[PDB]
Design a binder for these strands. Structure first.
Ligand SMILES: [Li+]
Ligand SMILES: [Li+]
Length: 135
RNA sequence: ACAUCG
DNA sequence: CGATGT
C-alpha cells in the first residue's frame, strides 16, 4: 500500500544475461548510493539480485540498522528466505567467481541472524525501484 | 501467468 | 526479440 521511505533499496544491473553483473544499494528516500559491487564478468540477473539483498543484510547488520530492504525480484526474495540460490547457471571456470560469491552469501546466511524485513518493491504501482540501473 | 534482467 | 526464475 504505502512505500516505507525509511529503507534500503537494492537492484542488479547487467550487460547481457548471462553477462556482466553488478548491483547497488541506495537510500530509498534520497537515492544516495550506499554501496556498489564491482562488475562481475559473468553471472545472471537473479544471482546479482540475490547478492544485492544479502549484501544489504550485511550492510544493515554492521550498522545496527533495523531498516527494511526493498527488492523488485520475486526470485531473489525467495532465495534469501530459503537461504538457497537455485540458479541454473552452469558451474564452470568462467562462472567460478559469481558462484563463489553466491556460495559465500549462502554461507553467511547460514551462520548469521537478522530481523530485516525483505519487502517487494511494487514496480507496477510505484515505478522503477530507486536502485534501478535505468537501462 | 507472475517477477525480473537486457 | 532473448535469457533468468517461481
Ligand atoms: Li530490478
Ligand atoms: Li533494475
Amino acid at each position: 500500500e504505502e512505500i516505507i521511505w525509511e529503507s534500503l533499496s537494492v537492484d542488479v544491473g547487467s550487460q547481457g544475461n548471462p553477462g556482466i553483473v553488478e548491483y547497488k544499494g541506495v537510500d530509498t528516500k534520497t537515492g544516495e548510493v550506499l554501496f556498489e559491487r564491482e562488475p562481475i564478468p559473468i553471472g545472471t540477473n537473479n544471482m546479482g539480485e540475490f547478492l544485492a539483498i544479502v549484501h544489504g543484510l550485511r550492510y544493515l547488520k554492521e550498522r545496527n540498522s533495523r531498516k527494511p530492504i526493498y527488492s523488485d525480484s520475486q526470485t531473489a526474495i525467495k532465495w534469501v528466505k530459503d537461504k538457497k540460490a537455485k540458479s541454473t547457471l552452469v558451474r564452470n571456470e568462467e562462472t567460478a567467481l559469481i558462484w563463489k560469491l553466491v556460495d559465500e552469501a549462502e554461507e553467511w546466511l547460514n551462520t548469521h541472524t537478522y530481523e530485516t524485513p525483505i519487502l517487494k518493491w511494487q514496480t507496477d504501482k510505484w515505478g522503477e525501484i530507486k536502485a534501478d540501473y535505468g537501462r
